[PDB]
Design a protein around this motif. Structure first.
Motif, mmCIF file in Angstrom:
data_model
loop_
_atom_site.group_PDB
_atom_site.id
_atom_site.type_symbol
_atom_site.label_atom_id
_atom_site.label_comp_id
_atom_site.label_asym_id
_atom_site.label_seq_id
_atom_site.Cartn_x
_atom_site.Cartn_y
_atom_site.Cartn_z
ATOM 1 N N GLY A 30 0.808 -1.205 0.000
ATOM 2 C CA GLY A 30 0.000 0.000 0.000
ATOM 3 C C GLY A 30 0.841 1.255 0.000
ATOM 4 N N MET A 31 2.135 1.095 0.229
ATOM 5 C CA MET A 31 3.060 2.201 0.144
ATOM 6 C C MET A 31 3.208 2.622 -1.311
ATOM 7 S SD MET A 31 6.810 2.761 1.715
ATOM 8 C CE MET A 31 7.126 3.633 3.247
ATOM 9 N N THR A 32 3.142 3.922 -1.554
ATOM 10 C CA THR A 32 3.174 4.449 -2.903
ATOM 11 C C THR A 32 4.590 4.445 -3.466
ATOM 12 O OG1 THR A 32 2.666 6.463 -1.629
ATOM 13 C CG2 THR A 32 1.182 5.893 -3.445
ATOM 14 N N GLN A 33 4.682 4.439 -4.795
ATOM 15 C CA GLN A 33 5.959 4.473 -5.509
ATOM 16 C C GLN A 33 6.898 5.524 -4.929
ATOM 17 O OE1 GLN A 33 4.102 7.005 -6.208
ATOM 18 N NE2 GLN A 33 2.914 6.815 -8.094
ATOM 19 N N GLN A 34 6.362 6.707 -4.662
ATOM 20 C CA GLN A 34 7.154 7.819 -4.152
ATOM 21 C C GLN A 34 7.853 7.455 -2.844
ATOM 22 O OE1 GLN A 34 7.971 11.361 -5.129
ATOM 23 N NE2 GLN A 34 7.885 9.884 -6.815
ATOM 24 N N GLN A 35 7.109 6.872 -1.917
ATOM 25 C CA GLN A 35 7.655 6.534 -0.609
ATOM 26 C C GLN A 35 8.542 5.298 -0.693
ATOM 27 O OE1 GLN A 35 3.768 7.932 0.695
ATOM 28 N NE2 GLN A 35 5.217 9.202 -0.437
ATOM 29 N N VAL A 36 8.142 4.339 -1.519
ATOM 30 C CA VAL A 36 8.945 3.144 -1.741
ATOM 31 C C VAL A 36 10.302 3.528 -2.325
ATOM 32 C CG1 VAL A 36 9.151 0.985 -3.048
ATOM 33 C CG2 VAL A 36 6.959 1.624 -2.030
ATOM 34 N N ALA A 37 10.274 4.391 -3.334
ATOM 35 C CA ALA A 37 11.492 4.865 -3.972
ATOM 36 C C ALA A 37 12.297 5.738 -3.018
ATOM 37 C CB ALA A 37 11.164 5.627 -5.247
ATOM 38 N N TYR A 38 11.600 6.502 -2.186
ATOM 39 C CA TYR A 38 12.252 7.360 -1.204
ATOM 40 C C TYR A 38 13.041 6.533 -0.193
ATOM 41 C CZ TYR A 38 11.716 12.412 -1.229
ATOM 42 O OH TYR A 38 11.881 13.756 -1.480
ATOM 43 N N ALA A 39 12.437 5.448 0.269
ATOM 44 C CA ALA A 39 13.053 4.604 1.282
ATOM 45 C C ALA A 39 14.120 3.690 0.685
ATOM 46 C CB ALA A 39 11.989 3.785 1.996
ATOM 47 N N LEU A 40 13.801 3.043 -0.428
ATOM 48 C CA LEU A 40 14.691 2.045 -1.012
ATOM 49 C C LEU A 40 15.762 2.677 -1.894
ATOM 50 C CD1 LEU A 40 12.331 -0.936 -1.787
ATOM 51 C CD2 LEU A 40 14.637 -1.150 -0.858
ATOM 52 N N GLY A 41 15.556 3.927 -2.282
ATOM 53 C CA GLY A 41 16.502 4.589 -3.160
ATOM 54 C C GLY A 41 16.247 4.247 -4.614
ATOM 55 N N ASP A 47 6.024 2.815 -16.060
ATOM 56 C CA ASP A 47 6.002 2.044 -17.288
ATOM 57 C C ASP A 47 4.622 2.078 -17.928
ATOM 58 O OD1 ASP A 47 7.256 -0.251 -19.054
ATOM 59 O OD2 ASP A 47 5.322 -1.005 -18.361
ATOM 60 N N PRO A 48 4.548 2.564 -19.173
ATOM 61 C CA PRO A 48 3.293 2.673 -19.913
ATOM 62 C C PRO A 48 2.843 1.336 -20.492
ATOM 63 C CG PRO A 48 5.087 3.422 -21.289
ATOM 64 C CD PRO A 48 5.694 3.058 -19.959
ATOM 65 N N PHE A 49 3.656 0.307 -20.303
ATOM 66 C CA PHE A 49 3.369 -0.994 -20.893
ATOM 67 C C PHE A 49 2.529 -1.836 -19.941
ATOM 68 C CE2 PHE A 49 5.704 -1.775 -24.896
ATOM 69 C CZ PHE A 49 6.303 -0.539 -25.033
ATOM 70 N N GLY A 50 2.557 -1.470 -18.668
ATOM 71 C CA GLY A 50 1.773 -2.160 -17.674
ATOM 72 C C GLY A 50 2.655 -2.993 -16.784
ATOM 73 N N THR A 51 3.953 -2.870 -17.001
ATOM 74 C CA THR A 51 4.925 -3.587 -16.212
ATOM 75 C C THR A 51 5.311 -2.771 -14.986
ATOM 76 O OG1 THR A 51 5.954 -3.565 -18.418
ATOM 77 C CG2 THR A 51 6.525 -5.393 -16.940
ATOM 78 N N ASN A 52 4.519 -2.902 -13.936
ATOM 79 C CA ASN A 52 4.732 -2.137 -12.720
ATOM 80 C C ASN A 52 5.411 -3.002 -11.673
ATOM 81 O OD1 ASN A 52 3.067 0.543 -13.198
ATOM 82 N ND2 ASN A 52 1.768 -1.139 -13.900
ATOM 83 N N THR A 75 5.122 -5.302 -6.767
ATOM 84 C CA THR A 75 4.034 -5.125 -7.711
ATOM 85 C C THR A 75 3.080 -4.058 -7.211
ATOM 86 O OG1 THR A 75 3.969 -7.533 -7.314
ATOM 87 C CG2 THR A 75 3.096 -6.726 -9.423
ATOM 88 N N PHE A 76 3.098 -2.905 -7.856
ATOM 89 C CA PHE A 76 2.249 -1.800 -7.456
ATOM 90 C C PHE A 76 1.248 -1.492 -8.554
ATOM 91 C CE2 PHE A 76 4.540 1.341 -10.046
ATOM 92 C CZ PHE A 76 5.792 0.766 -10.160
ATOM 93 N N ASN A 77 -0.006 -1.332 -8.170
ATOM 94 C CA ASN A 77 -1.049 -1.022 -9.131
ATOM 95 C C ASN A 77 -0.926 0.433 -9.585
ATOM 96 O OD1 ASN A 77 -3.862 0.529 -9.024
ATOM 97 N ND2 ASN A 77 -3.250 0.231 -6.890
ATOM 98 N N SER A 78 -1.566 0.751 -10.713
ATOM 99 C CA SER A 78 -1.393 2.024 -11.419
ATOM 100 C C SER A 78 -1.558 3.273 -10.533
ATOM 101 C CB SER A 78 -2.373 2.076 -12.590
ATOM 102 O OG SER A 78 -2.586 0.776 -13.125
ATOM 103 N N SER A 79 -2.256 3.159 -9.404
ATOM 104 C CA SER A 79 -2.395 4.293 -8.488
ATOM 105 C C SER A 79 -1.088 4.556 -7.740
ATOM 106 C CB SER A 79 -3.530 4.046 -7.495
ATOM 107 O OG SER A 79 -4.415 3.047 -7.971
ATOM 108 N N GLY A 80 -0.150 3.627 -7.869
ATOM 109 C CA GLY A 80 1.142 3.765 -7.236
ATOM 110 C C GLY A 80 1.231 2.989 -5.944
ATOM 111 N N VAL A 81 0.237 2.161 -5.695
ATOM 112 C CA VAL A 81 0.118 1.446 -4.437
ATOM 113 C C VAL A 81 0.642 0.020 -4.575
ATOM 114 C CG1 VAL A 81 -1.613 0.353 -2.930
ATOM 115 C CG2 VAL A 81 -1.770 2.792 -3.452
#
Length: 102
Positions: A30-41, A47-52, A75-81
């Motif tokens: 449920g953590m968003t891409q922004q926070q995941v990327a923030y924490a993990l670096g 990806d516009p192909f659907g490969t999240n 695996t994060f759904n398009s909302s970034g979750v």
């Protein structure tokens, strides 16, 4: 007047190469891409192909059978979750002991 300079560096630090296991454990579902990327670096990904799927690998099974490792897949759904995390040990599950001999 002598300058007494004796600094201590910690030989307990991991500055690169691979990601630390405890470091990947910082994030959650449920953590968003922004926070995941923030924490993990992690770098920005959209990806516009659907490969999240985000791929990471750390050390937990260094050597015993040569082929023994767990693939950390996010695996994060398009909302970034983060909807699902792929994390299963190489001990019968995501992977098992290599080749069914005996």
């Amino acid at each position: 007047s002598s300058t007494l300079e004796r600094v201590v560096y910690r030989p307990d630090i991991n500055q690169g190469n691979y990601l630390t296991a405890n470091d990947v454990s910082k994030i959650r579902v449920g953590m968003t891409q922004q926070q995941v990327a923030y924490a993990l670096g992690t770098p920005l990904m959209s990806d516009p192909f659907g490969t999240n799927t985000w791929f990471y690998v750390f050390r937990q099974q260094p050597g015993h059978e040569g082929v023994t490792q767990q693939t950390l897949t996010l695996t994060f759904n398009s909302s970034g979750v983060l909807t699902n995390i792929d994390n299963k040990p190489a001990l019968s599950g995501n992977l098992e002991h290599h080749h069914h001999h005996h």
